[PDB]
Amino acid sequence: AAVEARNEDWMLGPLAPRRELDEITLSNGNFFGSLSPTRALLESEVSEE
């Protein structure tokens, strides 16, 4: 997503969208520029190695 957002700001210029005011991404349920409780707290069970 950051690869496509960096290309629009470079192109649109004064028409850069206000992505922070947009709806959530149902693929994750997260807002703009927000992590997930599982990814922000690193509660992922990792292997023993």
Binding site: R39, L42, S44, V46, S47
Partner: protein, 48 residues
């Protein structure tokens, strides 16, 4: 004696000296990847 790179061609055309000033003003790295670390998001999650 060595391989001609895209940098050498710009130097011949004279455009390299103009690219250094712009990149320097913007703080972008002139010849190199800068002092930026590698992608760690997947690494911190235990990515193999």
């Amino acid at each position: 004696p060595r391989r001609v790179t895209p940098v050498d061609k710009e130097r011949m055309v004279g455009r390299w000296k103009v690219i250094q000033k712009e990149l320097q003003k913007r703080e972008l790295p002139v010849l190199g990847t800068g002092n930026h670390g590698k992608y760690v998001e997947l690494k911190w999650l235990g990515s193999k």
